[PDB]
Amino acid sequence: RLHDLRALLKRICSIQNYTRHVLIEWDVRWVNPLTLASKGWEPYQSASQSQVPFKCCCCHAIMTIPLLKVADYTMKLNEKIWNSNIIGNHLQKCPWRENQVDLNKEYYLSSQNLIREIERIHTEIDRIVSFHYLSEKEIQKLAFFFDCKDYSLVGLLLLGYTKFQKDDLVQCTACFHRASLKKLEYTEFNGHALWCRYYNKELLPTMLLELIGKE
Ligand SMILES: [Zn+2]
Ligand SMILES: [Zn+2]
């Protein structure tokens, strides 16, 4: 399937993985791991200090993202790259040229896919039994809805994270940034990319609370 969520997520994850040893100036609209993945692009080879190559999973066509050490022309350049490379480099009849994953429907939060977040949180809690930024009033209700006594775990999962290593590392499920639990203890620090589903921390808990009020 072209719009399969799991394939999109794995493309995003691989892009983030091979980009870790490099700093890239993404933008929320034109060029970012999300838009690349939504257009079927996967990492092709290891990126040099100057350019990051990608290959289409159907075409096998190659595109490249430049690197510079910047803010003056990022917008115009990235819009050009989106039109000419992320779309253009596709072969004429490749499905990814004229089609794109519906990110609003499948990736970003909506009332029709909030249940997936509920499932994720419940599954994480079950696998465990097997971060305060909301009012005590609110976290009480959120923890109650998930039948969980550990408020901090509920908050952490509401931030979209999941444990990564035996170490203090924790990884986001939608943008795959890595943060230390020590960082998130008593800090406003937002570890998400600007384009992440969870970048606005209050969005998911707010939708969940509004859902609670309607039951
Ligand atoms: Zn293609
Ligand atoms: Zn994230």
Residue numbers in the entry: 79 to 147, 152 to 212, 227 to 311
Lines quoted from the article behind this entry:
In Saccharomyces cerevisiae, the pre-mRNA leakage 39-kDa protein (ScPml39) was reported to retain unspliced pre-mRNA prior to export through nuclear pore complexes (NPCs). ScPml39 is required for cell growth in the absence of a functional Y-complex, an essential NPC building block required for mRNA export, and is recruited to the nuclear basket of NPCs by virtue of interactions with the N-terminal regions of ScMlp1 and ScMlp227. The crystal structure revealed integrated zf-C3HC and Rsm1 modules, which are tightly associated through a hydrophobic interface to form a single domain. Both zf-C3HC and Rsm1 modules belong to the Zn-containing BIR (Baculovirus IAP repeat)-like super family, with key residues of the canonical BIR domain being conserved.
Based on the domain boundaries identified by mass spectrometry, we generated a truncated ScPml39 construct comprising residues 77–317 for structural studies. ScPml3977–317 was crystalized in the P3121 space group. The phases and the structure were determined to a resolution of 2.5 Å by Zinc single-wavelength anomalous dispersion (Zn-SAD). The majority of the fragment (residues 79–311) was well resolved in the electron density, while no electron density was observed for two N-terminal residues (77–78), residues 148–151 between β3 strand and helix αC, a Ser-rich region comprising residues 213–226, and six C-terminal residues (312–317). ScPml3977–317 contains two BIR-like modules: zf-C3HC (residues 79–189 in blue) and Rsm1 (residues 190–311 in purple). The two zf-C3HC and Rsm1 modules form a single structural domain stabilized by the hydrophobic residues Leu87, Ile90, Pro111, Leu112, Leu185, Tyr189 of zf-C3HC and Tyr190, Phe272, and Trp291 of Rsm1. Cys134, Cys137, His172, and Cys176 residues coordinate Zn to form the C-x2-C-x–H-x3-C ZnF motif. Due to the different spacing within the CCHC ZnF motif, helix αC of the ScPml39 zf-C3HC module is tilted by 42° with respect to the corresponding helix αC in D. melanogaster IAP1-BIR1 domain, rendering the distinct spacing a key determinant for the topology of ScPml39. Cys268, Cys271, His288, and Cys292 coordinate Zn and are part of the C-x2-C-x16-H-x3-C ZnF motif. Thus, the distinct CCHC ZnF spacing between Zn-coordinating residues and helix αAB′ insertion between helices αA′ and αΒ′ represent key determinants of the Rsm1 module.
